[PDB]
Amino acid sequence: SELLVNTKSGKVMGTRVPVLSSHISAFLGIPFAEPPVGNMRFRRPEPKKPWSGVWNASTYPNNCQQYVDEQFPGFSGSEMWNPNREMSEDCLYLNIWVPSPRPKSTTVMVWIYGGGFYSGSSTLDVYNGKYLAYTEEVVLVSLSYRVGAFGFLALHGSQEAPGNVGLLDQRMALQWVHDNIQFFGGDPKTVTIFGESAGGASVGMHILSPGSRDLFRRAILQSGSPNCPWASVSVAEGRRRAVELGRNLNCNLNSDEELIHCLREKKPQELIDVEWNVLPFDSIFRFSFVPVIDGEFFPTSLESMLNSGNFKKTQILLGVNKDEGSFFLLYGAPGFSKDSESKISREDFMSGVKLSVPHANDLGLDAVTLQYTDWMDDNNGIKNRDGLDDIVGDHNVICPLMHFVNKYTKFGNGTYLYFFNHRASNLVWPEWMGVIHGYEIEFVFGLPLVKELNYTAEEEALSRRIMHYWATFAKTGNPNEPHSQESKWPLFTTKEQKFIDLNTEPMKVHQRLRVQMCVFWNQFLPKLLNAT
Amino acid sequence: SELLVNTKSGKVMGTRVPVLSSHISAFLGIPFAEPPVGNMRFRRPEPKKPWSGVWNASTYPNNCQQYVDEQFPGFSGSEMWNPNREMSEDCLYLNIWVPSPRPKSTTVMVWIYGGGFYSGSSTLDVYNGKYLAYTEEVVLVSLSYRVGAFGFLALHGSQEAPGNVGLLDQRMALQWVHDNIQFFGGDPKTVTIFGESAGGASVGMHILSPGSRDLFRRAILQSGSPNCPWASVSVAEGRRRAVELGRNLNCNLNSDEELIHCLREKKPQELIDVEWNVLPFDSIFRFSFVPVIDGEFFPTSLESMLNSGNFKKTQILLGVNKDEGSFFLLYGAPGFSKDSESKISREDFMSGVKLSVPHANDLGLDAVTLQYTDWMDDNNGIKNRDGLDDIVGDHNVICPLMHFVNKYTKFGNGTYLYFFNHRASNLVWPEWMGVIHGYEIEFVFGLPLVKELNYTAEEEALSRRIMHYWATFAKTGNPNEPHSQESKWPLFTTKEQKFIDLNTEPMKVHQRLRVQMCVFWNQFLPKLLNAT
Ligand SMILES: *[C@@H]1O[C@H](CO)[C@@H](O)[C@H](O)[C@H]1NC(C)=O
Ligand SMILES: *[C@@H]1O[C@H](CO)[C@@H](O)[C@H](O)[C@H]1NC(C)=O
Ligand SMILES: *[C@@H]1O[C@H](CO)[C@@H](O)[C@H](O)[C@H]1NC(C)=O
Ligand SMILES: *[C@@H]1O[C@H](CO)[C@@H](O)[C@H](O)[C@H]1NC(C)=O
């Protein structure tokens, strides 16, 4: 039967799912690791023991334990990102969408969800891989990984809570795909990993980590890069936060053994309730438990690895959205509200700047303020609001990604860069937020092709174009159709640094994406902070 | 006789001079101090002893000893600024242009020439006061003062070479005008002092110095302010330079007495030949002997005086030219030439930046470079050239003046600000230099009214308009004609910060002159240099 597949770990039975007046096969909730529960909490993952009989892969699995956003109860704009299945530490499963009839050896794409390393689910409606798998005829896989303390609590030196286990969860899933996707009709030698935000940073981390490089062919990074300021911490800071978490739960702190034992006896929600109390600074776009530069998963500092070319050399396709920072300002900066235009006063602008660059001294804060202030009209509420939006997006997403693309392109085999700037016609978030962090995902997954979702005809066309770019890149290492008559997405080169916009208007090629601001964030500010 | 005037110092006989098909009286070369020669070199000036008989004031006096520019021999653009009379240490004289018939008690304007405190003459063709005196019916006076080491060598603590004597020369001339102008038909209670560059800085210094305030009514500052970075030095730096001058002339340096005695035995040209060897840094727009913050002429630091309102409160009219920095880049920055378009390479841009801000550390240099570089087109020769031009003009003239105007306006009785941006149709300097430092002077003195000079009809109109603004301001404290139908020059206020452009086009009012760059130069950079 087309729904029965025998893998190296055992047999699995999928389910036939409808999609755009047709059907395809789906294998949901396939286990790739042993449940990281009890004594296994915080530990590196262990491969799933093979099973006898048939694994029922007809329904989505549980989501990993995580902080749940209740800032806007009932609001679809925020709830669409929350777990839609019951949460459990028993959450290491993957999902596969297979074209029908089953292919023999076709292109494989593996999705890695984002969520700042503190949240995320492979089961969100927005991550339904049936549209992409059906439309582009690729085998689509979505994996899962532990987030928050469960996946990133780090007490370097200890083997019980070494840190980065969430990244190892991802690697184990990639290993499973490498070893078994052939039975689902996928080509293990043509696997593209792609992800957004923390998922994009994760993709870059697998490009960097020697232990992950051999498991995939190409990569796509959406609004995220491994060198982002929020994406990793030092071993010392990771330890400090782990200890502070224990301090928040009245744990014995005399030794790592004592601390970990205490943390392992706590219910999942107990850790989550105090998770945010361990941050250094009053800040936005900063998360408690993230990857740690350990000298193992990451041999040396990310910068030294990027500079020496110590990473997988292949083709990459990546990009950012126009207003990456709006989400974070709305949730934590004074003056911003969901139901108002959020015009910002000069004073709230100052407060926002300090929250946005928590590690900077006063001189550093002055430099940022000067760089983003129009002194001919400094009390303009719209300008201050948009200025802060740019500060957050440039510092946390765009400039780190531009630093990554330029360093990578020197050693890589082909780079394609995009700037997504289309605001969906059916967005429920206010207009001031613009082209929001994460809202290009629905286009990548083809939701606009579903009539009931209320997208325009132009948006369906944009989605089809984007899905074809992504899948063609996954298949050939080039988003462009060999010998087509459509406008070509030029290769990003060290010299020309070209990129294209992604919207419903005719393709336009540009150069040096936000170069002025990124020279500030990537070269000047770091120098200022290190000298003063 | 109309040409004979009896002053408190003795009788003087002037000469009738033709002017625009008419005539007026001129009294040239009137002594206001005893020749500062021999034992008097470097000493404060002494009032001229009254004389018997009639002083022959029919010809221009000698010019003070100074460095003479020979960079472009025979070239009118540069030679028009050089001394046009024989040089001598016996140079403290003033010139007066009086309307005919002699007025009874009319508005008086006293011109103070510029020249970076190292040069200047009251006798330049461009400073001929007959046009202004005749056209606006004012008594026009031009004074002189010692420049270079002769007027500013400073060995604080010593009464033989205390420093600032050139400024005291200016004060003595103002005192003479206060005491005697009434005999020439001028009103000593309605005297306006005006000057350009070092002369403008000098005007601001008299506004600040308690000992000079009572000698004039209003002031006009053209392309210069007392707080300019090149306009003064500390007592320590002044001493260091005085000692280095002695070291350059093989002087005994065991004591001030030894040093001064040695310097007094040297011929004037001997001092001038080594004058430029005492600067701290490799730099442009920096001069060796300038005013010193002594605690006498200047009670405290200029900044503390400006902040506390420790200065004469009256009305002021001031402004700058569009391209103040071009002259200095042409003479000392690599890549600039008089006969080429001077497109600057990225490398020469860097060299230029270091020469322009000699006191800045590397981080400071990086900040300037970032602020003036278009990173989307960094190798554009025109942009690099114009960027450097702006750096020099903003740092040395515009921003210091804007800091002055804003601090002054808080306590003053009326401020009028202008931005001169008309390039003369008959300029002999290359086009890349734009609206050059000092080229608004010919309009203020009415040269465009002289047909033989080859100016256009529009330029004659601009000159007449400017002369009337200046003279009306001198007479009433307001450049505008009471109840006229012409466009009004608005008052510059702390809140609106309005100013007008001065060109042949219809008047346009603007606000916050180069505010973006001046926040950088006046607030950010100083903070960066002091913290790092
Ligand atoms: C497990 O598979 C069976 C079919 O064998 C079916 O009941 C369903 O798809 C799964 N069970 C649940 C939880 O509904
Ligand atoms: C990628 O690598 C292949 C084989 O080494 C080479 O022929 C090709 O030019 C490379 N492409 C780029 C854009 O570097
Ligand atoms: C001095 O005045 C006399 C007239 O009394 C006349 O010769 C001339 O104006 C002056 N002398 C010189 C130096 O020409
Ligand atoms: C100048 O001073 C006079 C008298 O003190 C005052 O009436 C006038 O308002 C002042 N003007 C300005 C612009 O400050």
Distances in Å between the Cα of B529 and the Cα atoms of B143, B362, B394, B525 are 39, 10, 17, 6
Residue by residue, DSSP assigns A508-522 as: -EEESTTHHHHHIII
Report the alpha-carbon angle B397-B403-B409, nearest 5: 125
Cβ atoms of A462 and A444 closer than 8 Å: no
Q: Which two tokens stand for residue B99?
A: 């309307």
Q: Which of residues 123-152 of A touch B (CB under 8 A)?
A: none
Query: Cα–Cα distance between B383 and B375 in angstroms, integer?
Result: 11
Name the residue among B363, B512, B520 with its Cβ closest to that of A370: B520
Nearest by Cα to A3 from A25, A29, A30, A31: A25
A437 is catalytic: yes
Query: Cα–Cα distance between A242 and A288 in angstroms, integer?
Result: 9
Query: Cα–Cα distance between A111 and B448 in angstroms, integer?
Result: 75
Tell me the HSE value of A147 on the side-chain side, using a 13 A CA sphere: 28
Cβ atoms of B185 and B314 closer than 8 Å: no
CB-based contact, A346 to chain B, within 8 Å: no
Query: Residue A378's closest chain B neighbor by CA?
Result: B516
The DSSP call for residue B397 is I
| Residue with CA at minimum distance from ligand 4 atom 6 | B413
Name the residue among B370, B376, B519 with its Cβ closest to that of A524: B370
How far does chain B reach from its first CA to its final CA, in angstroms? 68
Query: Cα–Cα distance between A130 and A6 in angstroms, integer?
Result: 21
Angle between helices B165-180 and B198-208 (to 10 degrees): 70
> At which residue do the structure tokens 């004389």 appear?
B51
Is B363 within 8 Å of A516 when comparing Cβ atoms?
A: no
Residues across chain B: 532
Distances in Å between the Cα of B112 and the Cα atoms of A31, B141, B162, B254, B509 are 89, 9, 22, 37, 29
Query: Residue A532's closest chain B neighbor by CA?
Result: B532
A324 is catalytic: yes
Assess whether the C-beta atom of B58 lies below 6 angstroms from ligand 3: yes
Query: Cα–Cα distance between B414 and B408 in angstroms, integer?
Result: 9
Report how far ligand 1's centroid is from the alpha carbon of A240 (Å).
Answer: 45
Q: Compute CA B228 distance to the chain's CA centroid, rounded to the nearest angstrom.
A: 11
Query: Cα–Cα distance between A114 and A135 in angstroms, integer?
Result: 24
Q: Compute CA B366 distance to the chain's CA centroid, rounded to the nearest angstrom.
A: 31
- Annotated catalytic residue within A25, A144, A197, A326: A197
Q: Which two tokens stand for residue B385?
A: 């050239």
User: In the PDB record, what is the listed experimental method?
Assistant: X-ray
**Dihedral sign (CA B320, B321, B325, B327):** negative
Query: Cα–Cα distance between B441 and B197 in angstroms, integer?
Result: 11
Report the alpha-carbon angle A508-A513-A518, nearest 5: 170
Query: Cα–Cα distance between A74 and A345 in angstroms, integer?
Result: 30
Resolution reading in Å: 1.8
| Residue with CA at minimum distance from ligand 3 atom 4 | B56
| Residue with CA at minimum distance from ligand 4 atom 5 | B413
Amino acid letter for position A449: L
Query: Cα–Cα distance between B531 and A271 in angstroms, integer?
Result: 42
Which secondary structure element, helix H or strand E, spans residue B420, and what is its range?
strand B415-420
Q: Which of A363, A365, A373 best probes binding to B when mutated, by most B CB atoms within 10 angstroms? A: A363
Assess whether the C-beta atom of A414 lies below 6 angstroms from ligand 2: yes
Expressed as residue numbers, the domain containing A94 is 1-532
B437 is catalytic: yes
Cβ atoms of B94 and B149 closer than 8 Å: no
CB-based contact, A376 to chain B, within 8 Å: yes
Name the residue among A512, A519, A527 with its Cβ closest to that of B363: A527
- Mutate which of A312, A409, A413 for ligand 2? The one with the most ligand atoms within 8 Å of its CB, which is A413
Report how far ligand 4's centroid is from the alpha carbon of B413 (Å).
Answer: 5
**Which residues are CB-contacts of B297 (< 8 A; sequence separation ≥ 6)?**
B164, B167, B168, B205, B209, B211, B291
**Which residues are CB-contacts of B194 (< 8 A; sequence separation ≥ 6)?**
B109, B110, B111, B112, B203, B219, B220, B221, B222, B470, B474
Name the residue among B512, B524, B532 with its Cβ closest to that of A370: B524
Query: Cα–Cα distance between B171 and B209 in angstroms, integer?
Result: 10
| Residue with CA at minimum distance from ligand 2 atom 6 | A413
**Strands of B186-196's sheet, edge to edge?**
B15-19, B22-31, B93-98, B139-142, B106-112, B186-196, B218-222, B316-321, B415-420, B498-502, B509-511
- Annotated catalytic residue within B206, B403, B422, B437: B437
**Strands of A22-31's sheet, edge to edge?**
A15-19, A22-31, A93-98, A139-142, A106-112, A186-196, A218-222, A316-321, A415-420, A498-502, A509-511
No. of helices (H) and no. of strands (E), chain B: 19, 14
Phi and psi at residue B191, in whole multiples of 5°?
-105, 130
- Mutate which of B317, B413, B480, B494 for ligand 4? The one with the most ligand atoms within 8 Å of its CB, which is B413
Name the residue among A363, A374, A375 with its Cβ closest to that of B528: A363
Residue by residue, DSSP assigns B257-301 as: HHHHHHHHHS-HHHHHHHGGGG-SSS-SS--SS--B--SSSSSS-
Which residues make beta-bridge pairs with A509?
A500
Relative to the alpha carbon of A218, which ligand is closest?
Answer: 2
Assess whether the C-beta atom of B54 lies below 6 angstroms from ligand 3: no
**Strands of B4-7's sheet, edge to edge?**
B4-7, B10-13, B54-56
Cβ atoms of B291 and B232 closer than 8 Å: yes
Query: Cα–Cα distance between B66 and B452 in angstroms, integer?
Result: 31
Q: Residue B388 belongs to a domain with what CATH number?
A: 3.40.50.1820
Cβ atoms of B375 and A516 closer than 8 Å: yes
- Annotated catalytic residue within B197, B326, B342, B463: B197
Is A515 within 8 Å of B366 when comparing Cβ atoms?
A: no
Q: Which two tokens stand for residue A194?
A: 């792609």
Nearest by Cα to A369 from A344, A352, A345, A381: A352
CB-based contact, A378 to chain B, within 8 Å: no
Cβ atoms of B243 and B215 closer than 8 Å: no
Query: Residue A531's closest chain B neighbor by CA?
Result: B532
In total, how many domains does chain B have? Answer: 1
Cβ atoms of B501 and B508 closer than 8 Å: yes
